[PDB]
Write an enzyme that holds these catalytic residues in place. Structure first.
Site, PDB file in Angstrom:
ATOM      1  N   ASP B 290       0.588  -1.290  -0.108  1.00  0.00           N
ATOM      2  CA  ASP B 290       0.298   0.333   0.051  1.00  0.00           C
ATOM      3  C   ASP B 290       0.811   1.162  -0.391  1.00  0.00           C
ATOM      4  O   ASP B 290       1.066   2.453  -1.024  1.00  0.00           O
ATOM      5  CB  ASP B 290      -0.805   0.251   1.129  1.00  0.00           C
ATOM      6  CG  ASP B 290      -2.191  -1.040   0.908  1.00  0.00           C
ATOM      7  OD1 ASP B 290      -2.851  -0.975   1.891  1.00  0.00           O
ATOM      8  OD2 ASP B 290      -2.186  -1.764  -0.299  1.00  0.00           O
ATOM      9  N   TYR B 374      -9.220  -1.244   1.331  1.00  0.00           N
ATOM     10  CA  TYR B 374      -8.623  -1.237   2.627  1.00  0.00           C
ATOM     11  C   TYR B 374      -9.074   0.253   3.313  1.00  0.00           C
ATOM     12  O   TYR B 374      -9.107   1.140   2.269  1.00  0.00           O
ATOM     13  CB  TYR B 374      -7.111  -1.428   2.763  1.00  0.00           C
TER      14      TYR B 374
END
Ligand SMILES: [Cu+2]
Ligand SMILES: [Cu+2]
Ligand code: NA
Ligand code: NA
Lengths: 619, 619
Positions: B290, B374
């Site tokens: 990420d 997420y």
């Protein structure tokens, strides 16, 4: 009805009257412990029978007694004379706090030790310290306290700054005799004061802290009925209080749609012990069972609004017995409030364009106790998402010694000449489980690493395994932080909509357990503290991991005795006992008063619900 | 004046001017990353020298460029052409989010796969998923994305409820080809919706939550000067923001009396990766960096008052670059506030009669980002007592798959036919230490148990040991929760009043580290994630534990290469890299949107101060 209600002043007075009437509470008698017992399994369907258990001491030297009274019926259920050499001494009496000092102040040996150190006896405080069980044969069956000395320069002085090392005395508090005075040599008495309200030490107080105001203009979101029944955000429970354990939670349940679903039948801290790691003969015997020896509930503080408990607070004022059986209230001894707890759930979706944020909250039920130098806050939390948590906050003043010339492997330096011996504070949480009712089991869950090879060609796979604990003999478990070890309590007869047994997962902090050598007196007396998790079959007399009478009691009772019964725990009424503690090497920052440090555990739902239980929380 | 001030809109425009001018930013160029570089060690002597670093992609197929610009002087300091096969591909572009879906929508293999399952192409979302490095030789030096499909039934539908399993595609984004389409077979696409704002799923919203109002009627106790310089309760720091790392803290120092004492030079989350543990070939390649591949800073949310941040909130609105070099504000992207934190210290003394209670508070600096499914909140906390803490809050929607008939060892069931593959979220905190200045060292501290015997006759003693990490080759360390393992960063040349080196102690949560086989691609590319604690000698080009270009980089970059220099770290300018994460076996309660779960770490002063630093906190 409310059979789980708090004891009232009237019930305690009535217990006094029943004991008096039965000839068990004459003028030589003192109450060392008194508490209401929980309803029997299967009652409630029956009419109420409020039963109280009492430990009665005799100041003239007669044997003590354990007594159960039915306050409902005005009867003595049972009364038995205790042989304390066998089953243990009764808890330390409040009234014994000053006796060690008083007896020592006219003892020639003690006076000679103080004179050698040029200390005014009128200034020498002596702590009433539990004795444990060591090599002194004359102590067997005698009610003994040990005494360590601290100088108080004036009435408002913190004596902890001025420990008198190299000196310890032992005292029979019933026969009023000093049995031994050990003086291994003079150490300097540290000179600096530790008066944390003295402007010379604090300097000018900060003026930089602007107010924070927390209010609820419509009042709190919980209700209290029947004196101690709480309903909050789908949770239901009863807040009990016991002079030994302090706050106890009963009947923790969650209203899921139309159904009240039990989770935990009883939750408490059933023991807490503070073992010291200094091999000096001056302190090598010291292990303070704050719960079992001292009774933490009896020393619960009155909690002041703004200072101790901030926001919109609802207080309970539990009633306890004094030494003569008269009721005594602990005003505002229990705090209850809800607080904001940041973000509950959040997602901003790229494909749907929907942005979603919800806030969390928790219900807090707490008390704070003071045991000599230590002060502890015991906090239970319930969250919107079904999580249950306990947290202990440890503060107070560290227990001090001299700091040896040339250092120490077992003591920290805090100030010139001032030491703090290494120690632990180790708790046992007793969780009488009731996941969707009483038919429960425990599995140990580890992460499972997988080898690269056939069926896992890229070496990315990982899994987990669960091992059912089928009998008590298999249910003494240790942590394994490396493999993410947790323990799941499930109901094998109650399945969620995916046909999987409903459960809750216990997440431990995986702090060190008892460090003492396994051959030590403390390893035997605090056997529970050597392992992270124990599971027993419920029994109404298996209340404390250390047994009923901890004071000067050897091994032979408590969890190791219970577990030997090797009872079936695979889909039965079971009890989880989780050991968790802090290992404290005191730092300079801990002196002269300690900033709070914390330890605890939590349980999270694990397929208990059919989907997130907080989809109905509003924006 | 402030050399650590946030980038302003004007600086980014000025950087854009320099690039386009020197022929680096035409119509075929795209900025994949842009940010301000920190000043060099000891630059406070000379005038300001604001430099920005830029990664530039080319959509025609030309080689990417790393470019450093001086905004202060209007020049190009350097510009190098990158061989991506060697040093890695550039971070995923925001504008590529839909390119995988579109290229597949016209592809015959893909359309066949959709038609066999009776799925309307206009309803099929495809995620732009990082590719990694596996067995496919053609992909070396090519910019690849992989595609996994999820069905969106209508515009507002949560596509995550409808994974299309057994199907995966690979895509060259630059040449717009579809390199592969893998169809291992049809799995039922799960049918239940996951729309957590749909009243049919939520049921009636609760009306039981009464308001909680948190206000500060005199405003906050912190000041903000020069845009991003914070002063609060003796703390001093600068709040930076970077499009890759997110919120970065600079110059964390504490005012002890009249000396500003550095503690941490720079604190950031320098990488975070989500490796998946499902061996199905449909997902066995998936590992989402990420931070390093997607850039969590650019996807920081605009945070709304009352919803995301509660109380008296001061916001920063960081500016970043779009793909063409224009400044783009993230409105209210950083929240700053103080909050109450329970009891700080408490003691009720029996001998002195003094009752004392003080309250704690903490300063909170946070942001929340969204990476596809997420959502993560990154929170830094500074406490009154000198403690520094980081906490990540993981939420969003779990990444889904089919749940196999007859179960799975690597996937959880969430709903009928709907699975969630097991995965981890593993963070790396890069702490460029400056404990009382830059001359630091790290010791590993373990609890030491002692055997009963001479010198420890009662078998109660325990101790600790500290091992100095002297060179980087010795500085790759694992957790040991059983022995209470921590790491102390000290300054050997700065001693407290008790003549002990000043220090801070890092307390880890000791959660599992990377579970993948050590021979896997992800163990090589995220080597940092296999161990809990790394210490390197500071170098200005060693910024991330995974290297500068993570996307499709073969193993070994970052920490393993840095550590290999085997530099002196015993009393030098050093950097601590702490690995910590969540191992997620998704539970039914995580669906359809997951309640927050947390992980983090803290550092507490360890003889840094001469006594408690909070004696001057007022009642
Ligand atoms: Cu302690
Ligand atoms: Cu997850
Ligand atoms: Na039970
Ligand atoms: Na450093």
């Amino acid at each position: 009805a409310s059979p789980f209600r708090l004891a009232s002043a009237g019930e305690i007075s009535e217990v006094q009257g029943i004991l008096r009437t039965a000839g068990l509470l004459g003028p030589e008698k003192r109450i060392a412990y008194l508490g209401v017992l929980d309803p029997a399994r299967g009652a409630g369907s029956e009419a109420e029978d409020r039963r109280f258990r009492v430990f009665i001491h005799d100041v003239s030297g007669a044997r003590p007694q354990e007594v159960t009274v039915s306050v409902t019926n005005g009867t003595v259920i049972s009364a038995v004379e205790l042989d304390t050499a066998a089953t243990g001494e009764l808890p330390v009496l409040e009234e014994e706090f000053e006796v060690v000092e008083q007896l020592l102040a006219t003892d020639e040996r003690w006076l000679k030790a103080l004179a050698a150190r040029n200390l005014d006896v009128s200034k020498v405080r002596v702590a009433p310290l539990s004795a444990g069980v060591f090599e002194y044969a004359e102590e067997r069956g005698r009610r003994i306290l040990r005494g360590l000395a601290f100088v108080q320069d004036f009435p408002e002085d913190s004596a902890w700054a001025h420990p008198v090392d190299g000196l310890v005395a032992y005292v029979d508090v019933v026969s009023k005799e000093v049995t031994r005075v050990i003086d291994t040599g003079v150490f300097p008495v540290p000179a600096e004061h530790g008066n944390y309200t003295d402007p010379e030490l604090t300097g000018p107080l900060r003026t930089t802290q602007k107010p924070i105001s927390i209010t609820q203009p419509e009042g709190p979101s919980f209700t209290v009925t029947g004196g101690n029944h709480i309903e909050w955000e789908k949770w239901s429970l009863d807040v009990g209080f016991d002079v030994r354990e302090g706050v106890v939670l009963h009947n923790i349940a969650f209203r899921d749609g139309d159904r009240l679903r039990p989770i935990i039948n009883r939750a408490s801290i059933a023991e807490m012990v503070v073992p010291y790691g200094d091999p000096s003969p001056i302190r090598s015997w010291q292990n303070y069972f704050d719960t079992g020896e001292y009774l933490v509930g009896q020393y619960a503080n009155s909690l002041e609004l703004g200072c101790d408990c901030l926001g919109d607070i609802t207080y309970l004022s539990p009633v306890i017995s004094d030494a003569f059986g008269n009721p005594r209230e602990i005003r505002n001894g229990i705090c209850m409030h809800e607080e904001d707890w940041g973000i509950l759930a959040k997602h901003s979706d790229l494909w749907s364009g929907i942005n979603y944020t919800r806030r969390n909250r928790r219900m807090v039920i707490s008390f704070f106790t003071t045991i000599g130098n230590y002060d502890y806050g015991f906090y239970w939390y319930l969250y919107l998402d079904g999580t249950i948590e306990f947290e202990a906050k440890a503060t107070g003043v560290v227990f001090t010694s001299a700091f040896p010339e040339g250092g120490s492997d077992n003591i920290s330096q805090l100030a010139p000449g001032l030491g703090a011996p290494f120690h632990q504070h180790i708790f046992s949480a007793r969780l009488d489980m009731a996941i969707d009712g009483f038919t429960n089991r425990v599995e140990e869950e580890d992460v499972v690493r997988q080898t690269m090879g056939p069926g896992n060609e890229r070496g990315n796979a990982f899994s987990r395994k669960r091992t059912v604990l089928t009998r008590e003999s298999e249910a003494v478990r240790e942590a394994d932080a490396r493999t993410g070890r947790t323990w799941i309590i499930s109901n094998p007869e109650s399945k969620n909509r995916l046909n999987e047994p409903v459960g809750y997962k216990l997440h431990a902090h995986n702090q060190p357990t008892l460090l003492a050598d396994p051959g030590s007196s403390i390893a035997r007396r605090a056997a529970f503290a050597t392992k992270d998790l124990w599971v027993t079959r419920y029994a109404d007399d298996e209340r404390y991991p250390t047994g009923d009478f901890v004071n000067q009691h050897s091994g032979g009772a408590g969890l190791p005795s219970y577990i030997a019964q090797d009872r079936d725990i695979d889909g039965q009424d079971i009890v989880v006992w989780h050991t968790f503690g802090l290992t404290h090497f005191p730092r300079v920052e801990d002196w002269p008063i300690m900033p709070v440090d914390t330890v605890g555990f939590k349980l999270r739902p694990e397929g208990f619900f059919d989907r997130s239980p907080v989809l109905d929380v509003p924006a």
